[PDB]
Amino acid sequence: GTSKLKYVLQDARFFLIKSNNHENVSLAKAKGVWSTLPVNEKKLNLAFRSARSVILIFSVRESGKFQGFARLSSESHHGGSPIHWVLPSAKMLGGVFKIDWICRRELPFTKSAHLTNPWNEHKPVKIGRDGQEIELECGTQLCLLFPPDESIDLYQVIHKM
Incomplete structure (x- = not known):
C-alpha cells in the first residue's frame, strides 16, 4: 503493498462521482475517460491545477457499492x-x-x-x-478500504505527479 498508493494519495483531493448506470463506469474503466456536467467540470479543473492528485471515487446509483477510483x-x-x-x-x-x-x-x-x-x-x-x-x-x-488491485502498477501514475 500500500506504500505507493499512500504516496499517490498524499495531499490529494477527492471527489464523489455518482453514475446512474454501470455502462458509463464500464466505459470509463475501458477508455480511461470521464465527463461531467459543467458545474462539476469547473470544480475538477480548478482542483486539477491545485493539487498533486485529484481522485474520483465512483459509485453507481442503487448499486450499494463504489466501483473503484481513478486519478x-x-x-x-x-x-x-x-x-x-x-x-x-x-x-x-x-x-x-x-x-x-x-x-x-x-x-x-x-x-x-x-x-x-x-x-x-x-x-x-x-x-x-x-x-x-x-x-x-x-x-x-x-481509498485504503478498497481491495488491492494487483492489475495496476502505480509506477507510471507516480511519474505524472
Whole structure:
C-alpha cells in the first residue's frame, strides 16, 4: 503493498462521482475517460491545477457499492473521440477528462459506514451529490478500504505527479 498508493494519495483531493448506470463506469474503466456536467467540470479543473492528485471515487446509483477510483491525468478538453455514454443530450455535458485507474475493484457501502465526510455535514461518505468533495482524511481512508488491485502498477501514475 500500500506504500505507493499512500504516496499517490498524499495531499490529494477527492471527489464523489455518482453514475446512474454501470455502462458509463464500464466505459470509463475501458477508455480511461470521464465527463461531467459543467458545474462539476469547473470544480475538477480548478482542483486539477491545485493539487498533486485529484481522485474520483465512483459509485453507481442503487448499486450499494463504489466501483473503484481513478486519478485525473488532464483537465477537461473538447473535441476528441466521441464517447457513447448512456445519458439520462451529449451537448449538455462538459469536456472530457483523461483518468488513470488506481483501483477497478468494488467496495460495498457496508464497509465504509465508519467514514463520515465533514464537507457533507458529516454524513456517511457514501451519501453525496455527484461532484461532492470528500475531505482529505475521509477520502484517504476510503481509498485504503478498497481491495488491492494487483492489475495496476502505480509506477507510471507516480511519474505524472
